[PDB]
Design an enzyme around this catalytic site. Structure first.
Site, short mmCIF file in Angstrom:
data_model
loop_
_atom_site.label_atom_id
_atom_site.label_comp_id
_atom_site.label_asym_id
_atom_site.label_seq_id
_atom_site.Cartn_x
_atom_site.Cartn_y
_atom_site.Cartn_z
CG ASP A 1 3.06 8.07 -0.96
OD1 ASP A 1 3.39 7.57 0.16
OD2 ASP A 1 1.87 8.34 -1.26
CG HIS B 1 -1.04 9.01 0.92
ND1 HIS B 1 0.14 8.32 0.66
CD2 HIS B 1 -1.65 8.40 1.96
CE1 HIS B 1 0.26 7.33 1.55
NE2 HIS B 1 -0.81 7.36 2.34
#
Ligand SMILES: [Ca+2]
Ligand SMILES: [Ca+2]
Length: 275
Positions: free
Chosen positions: A32, A64
């Site tokens: 990520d 995120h």
């Protein structure tokens, strides 16, 4: 003090915790936007960054990645939340920038890294509408290697009878995860199609945020981690199972909910899945 987010309960993770299975010794790669290493409700075991302009993987500029990691393994203590596999060894593999985007090559580099370092599970709470030959090859390589790969199905809703699952979740070798609300009803943004495999909580998922904060987000990125975390608990109980076995057990022990085009096989039940 600490709350147990509902989504965690909803897949029956607590049941494993009381048998004594919390994800110990299992390496999970969160592929990520990095993981904020300054969050006290997370314990990072290692990491690497594939974004050229942002070489520290322990620095999440988008938030995120940190939210996703919190679902998987927020620590079991007196504060914040609790993750599906709270004892998992978590690796921050940065492939997305501050703006949330990433290059295919960065993503591929991050998979290659995970492979090379003997990750047990990879989470890819990301996706695009186009795949590439090299993306497919690396994902195939991961599974060929023995790794369980999980990916968000995407947040493209429905489109008549067309598949709306994005890449890399569209690939057969990957577990694609759609989202349900607390009612087991699919969330309206949850992507659909033949490639959707399983469902997990994806609505108002409370997790860790950068800067020693906590917050709720919705989306299939929030659902995916639940499954990667579930794979982690299973491997803590059955270290000798192959990814083949783990994937099979998760898909054959779900709670069925509705046409598979929309729900895939249903909601995971890691208590059942774990044997
Ligand atoms: Ca905690
Ligand atoms: Ca798939």
């Amino acid at each position: 003090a600490q709350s147990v987010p509902y989504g965690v309960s909803q897949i029956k993770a607590p049941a494993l915790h009381s048998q004594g299975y919390t994800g110990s010794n299992v390496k999970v790669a969160v592929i990520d936007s990095g993981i904020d290493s300054s969050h006290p409700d997370l314990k990072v075991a290692g990491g690497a960054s594939m974004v050229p302009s942002e070489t520290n993987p322990f620095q999440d500029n988008n938030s995120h990645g940190t939210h996703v990691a919190g679902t998987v393994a927020a620590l079991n203590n007196s504060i914040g939340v609790l993750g599906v596999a709270p004892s998992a060894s978590l690796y921050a593999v940065k492939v997305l920038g501050a703006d949330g985007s990433g290059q295919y090559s960065w993503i591929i580099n991050g998979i290659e890294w995970a492979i090379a370092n003997n990750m047990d599970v990879i989470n890819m709470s990301l996706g695009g509408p186009s795949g590439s030959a090299a993306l497919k090859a690396a994902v195939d390589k991961a599974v060929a290697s023995g790794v369980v790969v999980v990916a968000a199905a995407g947040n493209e809703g429905t489109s008549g009878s067309s598949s709306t699952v994005g890449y890399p979740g569209k690939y057969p070798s990957v577990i694609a995860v759609g989202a349900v609300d607390s009612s087991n009803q699919r969330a309206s943004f949850s992507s659909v199609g033949p490639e959707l495999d399983v469902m997990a909580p994806g609505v108002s998922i409370q997790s860790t945020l950068p800067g020693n904060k906590y917050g709720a987000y919705n989306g299939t990125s929030m659902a995916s981690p639940h499954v990667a975390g579930a794979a982690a608990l299973i491997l803590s109980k059955h270290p000798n199972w192959t990814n083949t076995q783990v994937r099979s057990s998760l898909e054959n022990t779900t709670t069925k909910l509705g046409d598979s085009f929309y729900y895939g096989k249903g909601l995971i039940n890691v208590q059942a899945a774990a044997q």
